Amino acid sequence: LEALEAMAKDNQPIPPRAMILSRKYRTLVSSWIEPLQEEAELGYEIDYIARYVAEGGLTGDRKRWVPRRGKTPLDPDAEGFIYSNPRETSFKQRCLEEWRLHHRKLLKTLHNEGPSILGKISESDYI
């Protein structure tokens, strides 16, 4: 969001690399929600044939998701990175991970700083 605000301030449009995944729901807006790599429920059923003709139907121009032997990423989002796209992690998972890391570094500081702390109740509070 900060980067999007900076782009809006500098009048920079979004690059055309808003790549959709195998599920057309994926975008930079909502690929970070709890249901990952899964499409939400909608009133109308998903028309895979419609999508087929939309990407290009029988015009011989579609991305066919088939693994190949060569060292080439079949996923188009991996393009541009030296090794691979960053691993897919949800916002809740990132929040809980940073919370665990903050508490872990707090415990590390308590360990390598000795029992002496601002708190005056030592015996029960330490345990």
């Binding site: 998903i46 895979y48 087929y52 029988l58 579609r62 066919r64 998701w65 088939v66």
Partner: protein
């Protein structure tokens, strides 16, 4: 009785006339020239005096080629009116089709007219029997002009309509119904189109030429009508064919059939896995998923409750489909009904045939005794 090899569906008119004359000179008493709607509109059967010109099913034919509806029917009516005799031409056709009545209205009115419709009361033809089965469907036709006994057809309505249309031509020559026994036997002889199940003691295995989505859905509905239990289908698209057909067909098969095995019927210079991915795109899956699901033993079933399976070799796919069967379950091969040529790239092989499917039914007993399980595509083997 013999038929000469011809590349096109309708050969040249002059060559056909020369062959008919050579046959009538010695070895044949009659030379009947029968052509389809496209052949009649092209001019193959038009340049020949037709004694009887009847239509089995009148509908929109050659609409994209001729550019106008009812063009083939009008051409057939004009060809019949060019050479017509009193009480000699037969107009036996389904009364439900308006094109049939439009074609019967044109031409000489002195020609005999009749209808082969079952529901229509004016035609006086009706099945009046309930003996439909995959092996034989005998009906007791009760008509004044038509014969009493009917022919055993494999299809429910199409074969019944064909038998009803042929009963008129059979009774026109001879009023006695005993002469129609040979015709009924030849109709029940399991001809090329939509071949019947094998005569071996086993579950139903049928070979159909479902090269189009509409024909595939029609054959699946016909098999669902008769099919008491799980229906298994195996078919493939054609390399370099319209790929528009590919997504829909897979969905149409997965809808009706509980177990669908997709394999490349004709690679035709296209990767087998490359077209199978486009086929699975219709149901929402990709080759990467299938394979990952495949790595897992699970192969999760379609959300509708049906199981989809994918393989790249047609022979092993047909063998697994013919080995996975139940007492009431039926397997339907929809790749090549009246064709035995398989071309992968430049190479062409003729190994594909119904005998390959019959060998599977014959040898499934060895795999059953050994302990192999064919209920699912991941086969359980001892240890």
């Amino acid at each position: 009785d013999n038929k000469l090899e011809s590349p096109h569906t309708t050969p040249d008119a002059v060559l056909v006339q020369k062959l008919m004359a050579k046959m009538v000179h010695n070895g044949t008493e009659a030379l009947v020239m029968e052509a389809s709607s496209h052949g009649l509109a092209l001019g193959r059967c038009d340049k020949v005096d037709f004694d009887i010109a009847v239509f089995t099913n009148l509908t929109r034919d050659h609409l994209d080629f001729h550019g106008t509806e009812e063009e083939y029917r009008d051409a057939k009516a004009k060809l019949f009116a060019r050479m017509v005799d009193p009480a000699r031409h037969r107009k036996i056709v389904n009364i439900d089709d308006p094109n049939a009545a439009f074609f019967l209205a044109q031409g000489n009115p002195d020609v005999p007219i009749v209808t082969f419709a079952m529901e229509n009361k004016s035609a006086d033809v009706h099945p009046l029997k309930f003996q439909l089965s995959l092996f034989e469907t005998q009906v007791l036709v009760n008509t004044p002009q038509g014969i009493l006994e009917i022919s055993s057809g494999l299809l429910g309505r199409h074969n019944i309509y064909n038998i009803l249309a042929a009963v008129a031509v059979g009774i026109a020559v001879g009023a006695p119904l005993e002469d129609i026994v040979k015709g009924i036997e030849e109709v029940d002889a399991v001809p090329g189109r939509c071949e019947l199940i094998d005569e071996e003691q086993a579950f139903g295995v049928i070979v159909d030429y479902a090269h189009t989505p509409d024909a595939l859905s029609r054959l699946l509905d016909y098999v669902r009508e008769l099919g008491p239990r799980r229906v298994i289908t195996v078919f493939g698209c054609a390399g370099e064919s319209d790929r528009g057909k590919r997504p829909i067909m897979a969905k149409i098969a997965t809808d009706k059939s509980d177990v669908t095995i997709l394999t490349s019927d004709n690679p035709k210079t296209e990767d087998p896995l490359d077209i199978l991915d486009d086929m699975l795109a219709g149901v929402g899956w990709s080759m990467q998923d299938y394979l990952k699901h495949g790595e897992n033993d699970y192969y999760p079933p379609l959300p509708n409750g049906h199981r989809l399976f994918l393989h790249d070799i047609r022979r092993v796919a047909v063998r697994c489909a013919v080995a996975m069967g139940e007492e009431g379950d039926i397997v339907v091969v929809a790749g090549k009904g009246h064709e035995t040529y398989q071309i992968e790239g430049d190479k062409k092989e003729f190994f594909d045939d119904r005998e390959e499917c019959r060998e599977a039914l014959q040898y499934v007993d060895e795999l059953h005794q050994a302990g192999i399980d064919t209920s699912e595509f991941p086969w359980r083997l001892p240890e």
